[PDB]
């Protein structure tokens, strides 16, 4: 058994890899991409007038 | 928060609305938290949301005085992931140790592990940061998501 | 004439003319009207301009759309918005004021 558990652990501590990174990726993406749905709105109001 | 920035925080929430009806959903909540200054784990959000499924996640509404305790509860937030953790986090698949990984594995791992991404979420994030061999160096990709 | 108190001469004329700074939206804002809805450099799918004018926010009648629709330059199932904007408000018509 022995050596194989240490390998197990070392995969287990890396099998998620990595929510905290993806959350930063996400974080970044929303506050940029939103600019579109931000943009189109008052434009729709011009169209109405 | 100060009524100074809280005024601004309110505005960005109001600019998230769809109609005017004052009600940003349990969905969009995550983007409002982001856009104010956060990068929550989708879990951090789910925590203060009160654990809904897709149905009432889409159906339940929020208003700002339902949101501001949420944004406040996270913000003074536990542990914020440094450059050093993150590089080792991506370093995981460097078959030897090189500092470099192929942009195909990297496009994929983010579409299979942790808070899984779509191709859309990945391509915009990663593209143009592979080199002339199709390796993305991770070290700069990590810095890129930091100062962004 | 009664948009001024009486003797609309060379000065009273321009006295009301300049001071009135408000009315309709600017044409470049009016390009932004549908130019901010497009997801790339492209156009606007006609289904989306019909569905919106009737359903969304401030609503038209059928009548209101059909009038706007015979005037509306449809091509390739896409109401290429940039031209319709110039169609409504460029060096526009005379006469109506002063």
Curated annotation (Swiss-Prot), chain A:
Compartment annotation: Cytoplasm, Myofibril
Sequence ranges assigned to domain IQ in this UniProt record: 14-43
Subunit structure and binding partners: Muscle myosin is a hexameric protein that consists of 2 heavy chain subunits (MHC), 2 alkali light chain subunits (MLC) and 2 regulatory light chain subunits (MLC-2).
Record-stated family: Belongs to the TRAFAC class myosin-kinesin ATPase superfamily. Myosin family.
UniProt remark on domains: The rodlike tail sequence is highly repetitive, showing cycles of a 28-residue repeat pattern composed of 4 heptapeptides, characteristic for alpha-helical coiled coils. Limited proteolysis of myosin heavy chain produces 1 light meromyosin (LMM) and 1 heavy meromyosin (HMM). HMM can be further cleaved into 2 globular subfragments (S1) and 1 rod-shaped subfragment (S2).
Function summary: Muscle contraction.
This protein's name: Myosin-11
Gene name per UniProt: MYH11
Curated annotation (Swiss-Prot), chain B:
Claim: Acetylation is one of the keywords in the record: yes
Keywords: Acetylation, Motor protein, Muscle protein, Myosin, Repeat
CDD domains: EFh
All copies of domain EF-hand, residue ranges: 4-39, 81-116, 116-148
GO molecular function: ADP binding; calcium ion binding; magnesium ion binding; microfilament motor activity; myosin heavy chain binding; myosin II binding; structural constituent of muscle
Top-level taxon: Eukaryota
BP-aspect Gene Ontology terms: actomyosin structure organization; myofibril assembly
Stated role: Regulatory light chain of myosin. Does not bind calcium.
Assembly behavior: Myosin is a hexamer of 2 heavy chains and 4 light chains.
UniProt name for this protein: Myosin light polypeptide 6
């Amino acid at each position: 058994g022995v050596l194989a558990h240490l390998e197990e652990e070392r995969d287990l501590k890396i099998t998620d890899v990595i929510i905290a990174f993806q959350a930063q990726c996400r974080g970044y993406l929303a506050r940029k991409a939103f600019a579109k749905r931000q943009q189109q709105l008052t434009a729709m109001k011009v169209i109405q007038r | 928060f100060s009524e100074e920035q809280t005024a601004e925080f309110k505005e960005a929430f109001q600019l998230f609305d769809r109609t005017g009806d004052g009600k940003i959903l349990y969905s969009q909540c995550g983007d409002v938290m982001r856009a104010l200054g956060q990068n929550p784990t989708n879990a951090e959000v789910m925590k203060v949301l009160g654990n809904p499924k897709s149905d009432e996640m889409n159906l339940k509404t929020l208003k700002f005085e339902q949101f501001l305790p949420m944004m406040q509860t996270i913000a003074k937030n536990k542990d914020q992931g440094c450059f050093e953790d993150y590089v080792e986090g991506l370093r995981v698949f460097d078959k030897e140790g090189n500092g470099t990984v192929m942009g195909a594995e990297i496009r994929h791992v983010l579409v299979t592990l942790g808070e899984k991404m779509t191709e859309e979420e990945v391509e915009q994030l990663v593209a143009g940061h592979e080199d002339s061999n199709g390796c993305i160096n991770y070290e700069e990709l990590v810095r890129m998501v930091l100062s962004g | 004439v009664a948009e001024a108190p009486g003797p609309i001469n060379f000065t009273m004329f321009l006295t009301i003319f300049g001071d009135r700074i408000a009315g309709t939206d600017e044409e470049d804002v009016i390009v932004n009207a549908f130019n901010l809805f497009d997801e790339g450099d492209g156009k606007c799918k006609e289904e989306t301009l019909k569905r919106s004018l009737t359903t969304w926010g401030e609503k038209f009648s059928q009548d209101e759309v059909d009038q706007a629709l015979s005037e509306a330059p449809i091509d390739g199932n896409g109401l290429i918005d940039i031209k319709k904007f110039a169609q409504i408000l460029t060096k526009g018509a005379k006469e109506e004021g002063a």
